[PDB]
PDB file of C-alpha atoms (C1' of nucleotides) and ligand atoms in Angstrom:
ATOM      1  CA  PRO A   7      29.771  81.456 162.167  1.00 57.91           C
ATOM      2  CA  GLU A   8      29.119  78.742 159.548  1.00 56.36           C
ATOM      3  CA  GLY A   9      26.058  78.094 157.383  1.00 56.77           C
ATOM      4  CA  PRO A  10      24.419  75.472 159.635  1.00 55.62           C
ATOM      5  CA  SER A  11      24.462  78.095 162.371  1.00 54.72           C
ATOM      6  CA  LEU A  12      22.620  80.491 160.073  1.00 55.62           C
ATOM      7  CA  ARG A  13      19.972  77.889 159.148  1.00 58.62           C
ATOM      8  CA  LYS A  14      19.264  77.495 162.882  1.00 57.30           C
ATOM      9  CA  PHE A  15      18.954  81.262 163.343  1.00 58.11           C
ATOM     10  CA  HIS A  16      16.575  81.534 160.386  1.00 58.41           C
ATOM     11  CA  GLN A  17      14.459  78.710 161.824  1.00 57.98           C
ATOM     12  CA  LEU A  18      14.270  80.488 165.179  1.00 56.54           C
ATOM     13  CA  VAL A  19      13.094  83.630 163.381  1.00 57.20           C
ATOM     14  CA  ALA A  20      10.494  81.722 161.333  1.00 58.52           C
ATOM     15  CA  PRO A  21       7.563  81.536 163.848  1.00 57.91           C
ATOM     16  CA  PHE A  22       7.644  85.346 164.316  1.00 56.08           C
ATOM     17  CA  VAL A  23       7.233  86.090 160.591  1.00 53.98           C
ATOM     18  CA  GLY A  24       4.025  88.021 160.060  1.00 54.16           C
ATOM     19  CA  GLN A  25       3.736  89.573 163.515  1.00 56.64           C
ATOM     20  CA  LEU A  26       3.684  93.223 164.501  1.00 57.25           C
ATOM     21  CA  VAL A  27       6.844  94.496 166.179  1.00 59.68           C
ATOM     22  CA  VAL A  28       5.605  96.064 169.450  1.00 60.04           C
ATOM     23  CA  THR A  29       8.785  97.396 171.092  1.00 63.32           C
ATOM     24  CA  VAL A  30      12.425  97.425 170.054  1.00 60.80           C
ATOM     25  CA  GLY A  31      15.362  97.469 172.433  1.00 61.39           C
ATOM     26  CA  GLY A  32      19.036  96.615 172.455  1.00 65.48           C
ATOM     27  CA  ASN A  33      22.186  98.693 172.507  1.00 66.81           C
ATOM     28  CA  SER A  34      22.918  99.132 168.779  1.00 68.47           C
ATOM     29  CA  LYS A  35      23.749 102.684 167.735  1.00 67.14           C
ATOM     30  CA  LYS A  36      22.939 102.565 164.022  1.00 69.64           C
ATOM     31  CA  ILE A  37      19.396 101.172 163.861  1.00 69.04           C
ATOM     32  CA  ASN A  38      16.757 103.531 165.198  1.00 68.96           C
ATOM     33  CA  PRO A  39      14.283 101.286 167.059  1.00 72.32           C
ATOM     34  CA  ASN A  40      11.668 103.736 165.872  1.00 70.31           C
ATOM     35  CA  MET A  41      11.754 102.227 162.411  1.00 73.99           C
ATOM     36  CA  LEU A  42      10.584  98.781 163.376  1.00 72.53           C
ATOM     37  CA  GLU A  43       8.060  98.985 166.242  1.00 71.09           C
ATOM     38  CA  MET A  44       4.462  98.422 164.964  1.00 72.00           C
ATOM     39  CA  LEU A  45       5.669  97.182 161.613  1.00 75.09           C
ATOM     40  CA  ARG A  46       5.194  93.544 160.813  1.00 74.93           C
ATOM     41  CA  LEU A  47       8.087  91.164 160.397  1.00 75.15           C
ATOM     42  CA  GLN A  48       6.908  90.269 156.887  1.00 78.08           C
ATOM     43  CA  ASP A  49       9.818  88.092 155.691  1.00 76.37           C
ATOM     44  CA  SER A  50      13.001  86.343 156.829  1.00 80.27           C
ATOM     45  CA  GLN A  51      15.609  84.863 154.488  1.00 78.03           C
ATOM     46  CA  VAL A  52      19.033  83.274 154.986  1.00 79.07           C
ATOM     47  CA  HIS A  53      21.915  83.132 152.496  1.00 80.03           C
ATOM     48  CA  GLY A  54      25.331  81.729 153.508  1.00 78.99           C
ATOM     49  CA  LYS A  55      26.583  83.816 156.420  1.00 78.07           C
ATOM     50  CA  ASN A  56      23.864  86.513 156.171  1.00 77.39           C
ATOM     51  CA  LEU A  57      20.357  86.840 157.615  1.00 76.33           C
ATOM     52  CA  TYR A  58      17.871  89.271 156.066  1.00 76.01           C
ATOM     53  CA  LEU A  59      14.701  90.467 157.766  1.00 74.72           C
ATOM     54  CA  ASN A  60      12.047  92.522 155.960  1.00 72.56           C
ATOM     55  CA  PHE A  61       9.780  94.967 157.787  1.00 75.78           C
ATOM     56  CA  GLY A  62       6.637  96.470 156.352  1.00 78.47           C
ATOM     57  CA  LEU A  63       2.887  96.473 156.220  1.00 77.77           C
ATOM     58  CA  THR A  64       2.551  94.871 152.783  1.00 80.52           C
ATOM     59  CA  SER A  65       9.101  96.389 149.233  1.00 81.17           C
ATOM     60  CA  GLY A  66       9.585  97.307 152.879  1.00 78.53           C
ATOM     61  CA  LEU A  67      12.829  97.687 154.760  1.00 76.71           C
ATOM     62  CA  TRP A  68      15.548  95.074 155.037  1.00 76.56           C
ATOM     63  CA  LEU A  69      17.910  94.587 157.941  1.00 78.46           C
ATOM     64  CA  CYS A  70      20.967  92.421 157.275  1.00 79.24           C
ATOM     65  CA  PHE A  71      22.684  90.562 160.133  1.00 78.47           C
ATOM     66  CA  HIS A  72      26.305  89.379 159.982  1.00 78.58           C
ATOM     67  CA  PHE A  73      27.406  87.627 163.164  1.00 81.92           C
ATOM     68  CA  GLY A  74      30.567  87.591 165.254  1.00 78.90           C
ATOM     69  CA  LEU A  75      32.371  84.751 166.995  1.00 78.10           C
ATOM     70  CA  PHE A  76      29.793  84.863 169.809  1.00 77.19           C
ATOM     71  CA  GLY A  77      26.899  86.053 167.691  1.00 79.60           C
ATOM     72  CA  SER A  78      23.540  84.521 168.322  1.00 80.62           C
ATOM     73  CA  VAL A  79      19.822  84.698 167.718  1.00 78.95           C
ATOM     74  CA  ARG A  80      17.653  83.859 170.736  1.00 77.31           C
ATOM     75  CA  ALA A  81      13.889  83.251 170.789  1.00 80.61           C
ATOM     76  CA  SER A  82      12.237  84.588 173.951  1.00 78.57           C
ATOM     77  CA  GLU A  83      15.385  83.885 175.979  1.00 77.13           C
ATOM     78  CA  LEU A  84      18.363  85.907 177.231  1.00 74.66           C
ATOM     79  CA  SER A  85      21.997  84.847 177.538  1.00 74.45           C
ATOM     80  CA  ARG A  86      23.702  85.167 180.925  1.00 76.02           C
ATOM     81  CA  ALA A  87      27.106  84.943 182.552  1.00 74.05           C
ATOM     82  CA  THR A  88      27.926  81.709 184.366  1.00 73.95           C
ATOM     83  CA  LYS A  89      31.155  82.671 186.159  1.00 71.03           C
ATOM     84  CA  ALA A  90      33.535  85.581 186.676  1.00 68.43           C
ATOM     85  CA  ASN A  91      35.915  86.773 183.988  1.00 64.74           C
ATOM     86  CA  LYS A  92      39.576  86.331 184.925  1.00 62.66           C
ATOM     87  CA  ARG A  93      39.691  90.022 185.850  1.00 62.05           C
ATOM     88  CA  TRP A  94      30.212  88.244 186.192  1.00 59.48           C
ATOM     89  CA  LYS A  95      28.972  90.656 183.498  1.00 61.13           C
ATOM     90  CA  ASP A  96      26.012  89.597 181.384  1.00 61.93           C
ATOM     91  CA  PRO A  97      26.124  90.029 177.595  1.00 60.43           C
ATOM     92  CA  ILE A  98      24.004  92.817 176.144  1.00 61.29           C
ATOM     93  CA  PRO A  99      21.956  92.057 173.026  1.00 60.07           C
ATOM     94  CA  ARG A 100      22.449  94.427 170.137  1.00 57.21           C
ATOM     95  CA  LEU A 101      18.877  94.321 168.957  1.00 53.76           C
ATOM     96  CA  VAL A 102      15.666  92.993 170.500  1.00 55.25           C
ATOM     97  CA  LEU A 103      12.404  92.735 168.570  1.00 55.43           C
ATOM     98  CA  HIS A 104       9.528  92.312 171.025  1.00 54.59           C
ATOM     99  CA  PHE A 105       6.212  90.898 169.906  1.00 55.57           C
ATOM    100  CA  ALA A 106       2.931  90.626 171.741  1.00 57.30           C
ATOM    101  CA  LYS A 107       3.723  87.017 172.602  1.00 56.73           C
ATOM    102  CA  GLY A 108       7.536  86.628 172.366  1.00 56.59           C
ATOM    103  CA  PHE A 109      10.759  88.256 171.192  1.00 55.29           C
ATOM    104  CA  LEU A 110      13.944  87.802 169.188  1.00 53.16           C
ATOM    105  CA  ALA A 111      17.329  88.848 170.575  1.00 54.35           C
ATOM    106  CA  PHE A 112      20.381  89.495 168.374  1.00 53.44           C
ATOM    107  CA  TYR A 113      23.891  89.342 169.937  1.00 53.98           C
ATOM    108  CA  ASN A 114      27.415  90.182 168.664  1.00 52.32           C
ATOM    109  CA  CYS A 115      26.243  91.062 165.166  1.00 53.36           C
ATOM    110  CA  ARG A 116      26.771  93.867 162.704  1.00 52.81           C
ATOM    111  CA  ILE A 117      23.253  95.020 161.704  1.00 53.20           C
ATOM    112  CA  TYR A 118      22.626  97.378 158.823  1.00 51.78           C
ATOM    113  CA  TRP A 119      20.027  98.673 156.391  1.00 52.49           C
ATOM    114  CA  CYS A 120      20.173  97.172 152.911  1.00 52.92           C
ATOM    115  CA  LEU A 121      18.289  97.488 149.647  1.00 52.05           C
ATOM    116  CA  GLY A 122      17.098  93.911 150.070  1.00 53.36           C
ATOM    117  CA  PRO A 123      18.299  90.319 150.214  1.00 53.88           C
ATOM    118  CA  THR A 124      20.669  88.434 147.989  1.00 53.79           C
ATOM    119  CA  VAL A 125      19.520  84.863 148.760  1.00 53.67           C
ATOM    120  CA  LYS A 126      20.374  82.395 145.975  1.00 56.95           C
ATOM    121  CA  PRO A 127      20.917  78.746 147.009  1.00 54.22           C
ATOM    122  CA  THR A 128      23.071  77.909 143.965  1.00 53.26           C
ATOM    123  CA  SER A 129      26.082  79.241 145.917  1.00 53.06           C
ATOM    124  CA  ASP A 130      24.942  77.792 149.278  1.00 52.68           C
ATOM    125  CA  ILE A 131      26.567  74.556 150.515  1.00 53.00           C
ATOM    126  CA  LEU A 132      23.493  73.328 152.423  1.00 55.65           C
ATOM    127  CA  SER A 133      20.817  74.053 149.855  1.00 51.99           C
ATOM    128  CA  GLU A 134      19.511  71.455 147.430  1.00 49.25           C
ATOM    129  CA  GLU A 135      20.376  73.835 144.576  1.00 51.40           C
ATOM    130  CA  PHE A 136      24.083  73.994 145.504  1.00 52.32           C
ATOM    131  CA  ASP A 137      25.720  74.354 142.102  1.00 49.27           C
ATOM    132  CA  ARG A 138      28.734  72.019 142.123  1.00 51.74           C
ATOM    133  CA  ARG A 139      29.732  73.021 138.572  1.00 51.41           C
ATOM    134  CA  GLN A 140      30.499  76.576 139.658  1.00 53.86           C
ATOM    135  CA  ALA A 141      32.148  75.323 142.855  1.00 54.30           C
ATOM    136  CA  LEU A 142      34.473  73.045 140.875  1.00 54.76           C
ATOM    137  CA  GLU A 143      35.307  75.864 138.479  1.00 50.55           C
ATOM    138  CA  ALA A 144      36.249  77.935 141.513  1.00 52.25           C
ATOM    139  CA  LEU A 145      38.285  75.144 143.097  1.00 52.01           C
ATOM    140  CA  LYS A 146      40.293  74.429 139.928  1.00 51.49           C
ATOM    141  CA  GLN A 147      41.954  77.855 139.875  1.00 49.86           C
ATOM    142  CA  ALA A 148      45.683  78.220 140.586  1.00 46.31           C
ATOM    143  CA  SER A 149      45.078  79.095 144.199  1.00 46.75           C
ATOM    144  CA  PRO A 150      45.314  77.042 147.400  1.00 47.20           C
ATOM    145  CA  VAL A 151      42.067  75.184 147.946  1.00 48.92           C
ATOM    146  CA  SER A 152      41.993  76.288 151.556  1.00 46.61           C
ATOM    147  CA  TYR A 153      41.617  79.849 150.311  1.00 47.05           C
ATOM    148  CA  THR A 154      38.957  79.079 147.700  1.00 45.91           C
ATOM    149  CA  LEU A 155      36.788  77.043 150.050  1.00 45.59           C
ATOM    150  CA  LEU A 156      36.137  80.154 152.135  1.00 46.97           C
ATOM    151  CA  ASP A 157      34.975  82.270 149.175  1.00 43.63           C
ATOM    152  CA  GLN A 158      31.322  82.876 150.075  1.00 41.85           C
ATOM    153  CA  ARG A 159      30.451  83.388 146.423  1.00 42.52           C
ATOM    154  CA  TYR A 160      30.888  79.671 145.793  1.00 46.13           C
ATOM    155  CA  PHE A 161      30.701  78.135 149.262  1.00 49.99           C
ATOM    156  CA  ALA A 162      28.130  80.244 151.169  1.00 50.21           C
ATOM    157  CA  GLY A 163      28.126  78.903 154.719  1.00 50.30           C
ATOM    158  CA  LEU A 164      31.620  77.405 154.649  1.00 50.58           C
ATOM    159  CA  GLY A 165      33.702  78.604 157.588  1.00 51.38           C
ATOM    160  CA  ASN A 166      36.821  77.462 159.375  1.00 49.29           C
ATOM    161  CA  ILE A 167      35.648  74.233 160.991  1.00 50.04           C
ATOM    162  CA  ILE A 168      34.362  72.964 157.656  1.00 52.41           C
ATOM    163  CA  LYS A 169      37.465  74.137 155.793  1.00 52.24           C
ATOM    164  CA  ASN A 170      39.824  72.285 158.072  1.00 53.98           C
ATOM    165  CA  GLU A 171      37.774  69.112 158.503  1.00 51.53           C
ATOM    166  CA  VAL A 172      36.914  68.525 154.827  1.00 49.84           C
ATOM    167  CA  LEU A 173      40.516  69.122 153.725  1.00 46.71           C
ATOM    168  CA  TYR A 174      41.491  66.343 156.117  1.00 46.57           C
ATOM    169  CA  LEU A 175      38.644  64.058 154.987  1.00 46.84           C
ATOM    170  CA  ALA A 176      39.693  64.484 151.363  1.00 45.12           C
ATOM    171  CA  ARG A 177      43.365  64.037 152.382  1.00 47.05           C
ATOM    172  CA  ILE A 178      44.226  67.334 150.717  1.00 45.88           C
ATOM    173  CA  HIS A 179      46.941  69.703 151.922  1.00 45.39           C
ATOM    174  CA  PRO A 180      45.536  73.182 152.540  1.00 47.33           C
ATOM    175  CA  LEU A 181      48.185  74.889 150.420  1.00 45.34           C
ATOM    176  CA  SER A 182      47.736  72.554 147.432  1.00 46.83           C
ATOM    177  CA  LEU A 183      46.762  74.593 144.385  1.00 47.27           C
ATOM    178  CA  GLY A 184      43.370  73.652 142.976  1.00 50.35           C
ATOM    179  CA  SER A 185      45.057  73.619 139.570  1.00 50.16           C
ATOM    180  CA  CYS A 186      47.503  70.878 140.708  1.00 49.16           C
ATOM    181  CA  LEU A 187      44.784  68.555 142.028  1.00 50.50           C
ATOM    182  CA  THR A 188      43.128  65.821 139.972  1.00 49.48           C
ATOM    183  CA  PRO A 189      39.470  66.175 138.948  1.00 51.99           C
ATOM    184  CA  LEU A 190      38.751  63.099 141.098  1.00 50.25           C
ATOM    185  CA  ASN A 191      40.391  64.895 144.045  1.00 46.31           C
ATOM    186  CA  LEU A 192      38.199  67.977 143.749  1.00 46.19           C
ATOM    187  CA  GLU A 193      35.137  65.778 143.307  1.00 43.40           C
ATOM    188  CA  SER A 194      35.948  64.044 146.610  1.00 45.30           C
ATOM    189  CA  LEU A 195      36.458  67.482 148.175  1.00 45.41           C
ATOM    190  CA  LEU A 196      32.977  68.646 147.122  1.00 46.02           C
ATOM    191  CA  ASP A 197      31.445  65.377 148.284  1.00 47.59           C
ATOM    192  CA  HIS A 198      32.983  65.893 151.702  1.00 45.48           C
ATOM    193  CA  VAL A 199      31.937  69.546 151.836  1.00 47.82           C
ATOM    194  CA  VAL A 200      28.296  68.569 151.452  1.00 46.13           C
ATOM    195  CA  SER A 201      28.408  65.394 153.532  1.00 48.04           C
ATOM    196  CA  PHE A 202      30.268  66.956 156.469  1.00 47.23           C
ATOM    197  CA  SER A 203      28.116  70.087 156.602  1.00 45.24           C
ATOM    198  CA  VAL A 204      24.936  67.978 156.529  1.00 45.07           C
ATOM    199  CA  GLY A 205      26.262  65.554 159.147  1.00 41.24           C
ATOM    200  CA  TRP A 206      27.188  68.441 161.456  1.00 41.65           C
ATOM    201  CA  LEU A 207      23.648  69.735 161.041  1.00 39.55           C
ATOM    202  CA  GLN A 208      22.228  66.320 162.021  1.00 36.22           C
ATOM    203  CA  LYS A 209      24.397  66.315 165.154  1.00 36.24           C
ATOM    204  CA  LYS A 210      23.171  69.837 165.935  1.00 36.47           C
ATOM    205  CA  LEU A 211      19.462  68.969 165.657  1.00 35.92           C
ATOM    206  CA  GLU A 212      20.055  66.366 168.348  1.00 37.12           C
ATOM    207  CA  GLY A 213      22.362  67.411 171.188  1.00 36.99           C
ATOM    208  CA  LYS A 214      25.200  65.259 169.965  1.00 38.00           C
ATOM    209  CA  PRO A 215      28.720  66.723 170.178  1.00 44.10           C
ATOM    210  CA  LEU A 216      30.557  67.300 166.937  1.00 42.07           C
ATOM    211  CA  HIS A 217      34.018  65.756 167.408  1.00 46.65           C
ATOM    212  CA  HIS A 218      36.834  67.256 165.384  1.00 45.86           C
ATOM    213  CA  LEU A 219      39.149  65.066 163.343  1.00 42.34           C
ATOM    214  CA  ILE A 220      41.823  67.729 162.663  1.00 44.13           C
ATOM    215  CA  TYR A 221      40.413  71.076 163.835  1.00 40.11           C
ATOM    216  CA  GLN A 222      41.971  72.087 167.177  1.00 40.15           C
ATOM    217  CA  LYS A 223      43.501  68.624 167.613  1.00 36.80           C
ATOM    218  CA  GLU A 224      47.067  67.851 168.649  1.00 37.29           C
ATOM    219  CA  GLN A 225      47.085  64.502 166.824  1.00 36.41           C
ATOM    220  CA  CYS A 226      45.286  63.111 163.805  1.00 39.00           C
ATOM    221  CA  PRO A 227      43.246  59.891 163.767  1.00 38.26           C
ATOM    222  CA  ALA A 228      46.398  58.043 162.664  1.00 38.41           C
ATOM    223  CA  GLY A 229      48.366  59.396 165.636  1.00 40.25           C
ATOM    224  CA  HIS A 230      50.488  61.987 163.800  1.00 40.32           C
ATOM    225  CA  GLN A 231      51.359  65.448 165.042  1.00 40.40           C
ATOM    226  CA  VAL A 232      48.974  68.102 163.693  1.00 41.37           C
ATOM    227  CA  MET A 233      50.533  71.331 162.351  1.00 41.48           C
ATOM    228  CA  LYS A 234      48.895  74.722 162.851  1.00 41.51           C
ATOM    229  CA  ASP A 235      49.647  77.917 160.911  1.00 38.17           C
ATOM    230  CA  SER A 236      47.854  80.969 159.455  1.00 39.19           C
ATOM    231  CA  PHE A 237      47.533  81.559 155.711  1.00 37.28           C
ATOM    232  CA  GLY A 238      45.622  84.034 153.517  1.00 41.39           C
ATOM    233  CA  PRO A 239      44.889  87.817 153.330  1.00 42.54           C
ATOM    234  CA  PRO A 240      45.450  89.745 156.596  1.00 42.75           C
ATOM    235  CA  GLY A 241      41.810  90.856 156.659  1.00 40.77           C
ATOM    236  CA  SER A 242      40.627  87.226 156.710  1.00 44.56           C
ATOM    237  CA  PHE A 243      39.128  85.930 159.963  1.00 42.37           C
ATOM    238  CA  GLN A 244      39.727  82.269 159.050  1.00 40.91           C
ATOM    239  CA  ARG A 245      43.460  82.136 158.457  1.00 39.91           C
ATOM    240  CA  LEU A 246      44.043  79.444 161.098  1.00 38.10           C
ATOM    241  CA  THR A 247      44.690  76.071 159.510  1.00 43.73           C
ATOM    242  CA  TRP A 248      45.173  72.602 160.981  1.00 41.81           C
ATOM    243  CA  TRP A 249      46.593  69.752 158.935  1.00 42.88           C
ATOM    244  CA  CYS A 250      48.573  66.535 159.104  1.00 45.46           C
ATOM    245  CA  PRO A 251      51.545  66.603 156.688  1.00 41.62           C
ATOM    246  CA  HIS A 252      51.515  62.815 156.566  1.00 40.30           C
ATOM    247  CA  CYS A 253      47.838  62.330 155.725  1.00 39.60           C
ATOM    248  CA  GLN A 254      47.674  65.511 153.604  1.00 38.48           C
ATOM    249  CA  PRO A 255      50.903  65.708 151.589  1.00 38.48           C
ATOM    250  CA  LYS A 256      51.038  68.881 149.550  1.00 35.89           C
ATOM    251  CA  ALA A 257      50.457  68.101 145.907  1.00 32.01           C
ATOM    252  CA  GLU A 258      53.300  69.424 143.769  1.00 30.94           C
ATOM    253  CA  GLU A 259      53.531  71.221 140.449  1.00 32.82           C
TER     254      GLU A 259
ATOM    255  C1'  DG B 239      46.104 102.161 165.089  1.00 28.60           C
ATOM    256  C1'  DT B 240      46.623  97.897 168.497  1.00 29.99           C
ATOM    257  C1'  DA B 241      45.016  94.326 172.329  1.00 32.59           C
ATOM    258  C1'  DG B 242      41.803  91.545 173.829  1.00 32.99           C
ATOM    259  C1'  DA B 243      37.020  89.703 175.881  1.00 29.53           C
ATOM    260  C1'  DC B 244      33.695  87.187 174.328  1.00 28.94           C
ATOM    261  C1'  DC B 245      28.868  82.914 178.533  1.00 28.07           C
ATOM    262  C1'  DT B 246      31.029  78.763 175.448  1.00 26.54           C
ATOM    263  C1'  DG B 247      31.761  73.774 172.928  1.00 27.22           C
ATOM    264  C1'  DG B 248      35.208  70.851 172.454  1.00 28.05           C
ATOM    265  C1'  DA B 249      39.901  69.300 173.699  1.00 25.90           C
ATOM    266  C1'  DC B 250      43.368  68.797 176.630  1.00 25.59           C
ATOM    267  C1'  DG B 251      45.837  67.925 181.327  1.00 22.84           C
TER     268       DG B 251
ATOM    269  C1'  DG C 235      33.924  64.765 186.432  1.00 21.65           C
ATOM    270  C1'  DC C 236      37.483  69.309 187.249  1.00 22.67           C
ATOM    271  C1'  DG C 237      40.166  73.008 185.465  1.00 21.99           C
ATOM    272  C1'  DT C 238      41.943  75.543 181.935  1.00 20.33           C
ATOM    273  C1'  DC C 239      42.311  77.160 177.144  1.00 21.72           C
ATOM    274  C1'  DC C 240      40.889  79.409 172.777  1.00 21.51           C
ATOM    275  C1'  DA C 241      38.545  80.317 168.758  1.00 18.84           C
ATOM    276  C1'  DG C 242      33.527  88.316 163.963  1.00 17.38           C
ATOM    277  C1'  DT C 243      31.825  91.934 166.597  1.00 15.30           C
ATOM    278  C1'  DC C 244      32.655  94.815 169.984  1.00 16.23           C
ATOM    279  C1'  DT C 245      35.152  97.792 173.363  1.00 16.45           C
ATOM    280  C1'  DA C 246      39.360 100.424 175.507  1.00 14.06           C
ATOM    281  C1'  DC C 247      43.024 102.943 174.866  1.00 10.48           C
TER     282       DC C 247
HETATM  283 ZN1   ZN D 527      48.003  61.827 159.894  1.00  9.59          ZN
END
DNA sequence: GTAGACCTGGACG
DNA sequence: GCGTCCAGTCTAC
């Protein structure tokens, strides 16, 4: 659900760190609510698309959250239905941590026990420590850049809106092989990765709408027809790809 | 296994 | 503005 989205969720968690969990609800099968209640939320960490919560009385237990298309974290607030589905049923949170003075609700998310966190901001596109050397080394391989950009090892937080928009901003075709691009090209691509993700975050802190340049658009800024197709491994959830053949000619061998 | 809703912003008509 | 569409986890079958 993109790395800016996870930074927001982590921030919503932050004021509850250090409080006793009083009651635990939600519909999730796996996580026995009788492991959390009356422990303290003693740490919260975010890395790329993952959120890690630690529970203990200090090391401790870690719950990892990985969110779906409609996944969300909500602070002392419930989501509700606004109209009838084509065939009004409110969404059911998967986990709720209740504190003495508020709660956190977790929706449309796989939640599981883990040994701990893996939170390193070298591989994280929004962190100050984002390691562009390793990102470039990943981008230069003989693979379409649109595939490599989604590798969370090098671009933690990069999802489909970022993929599609930055490829347009760099005027790079999504099937161009990183090995057939110039070093200047891939430098512009990294610049746009960082700039666009940060700008989107700025728009999100205010209530400003993010307007797509290529993503889900019929025409490009120049007025061309935008092509849409799906590329990558069949497991992938971000195969959908928008591009303008005119502004993003495929670089050739 | 497959088919599809999703409480929703952003983009169309 | 008004209406409609659709883009990881979960459910139905
Ligand atoms: Zn164009």
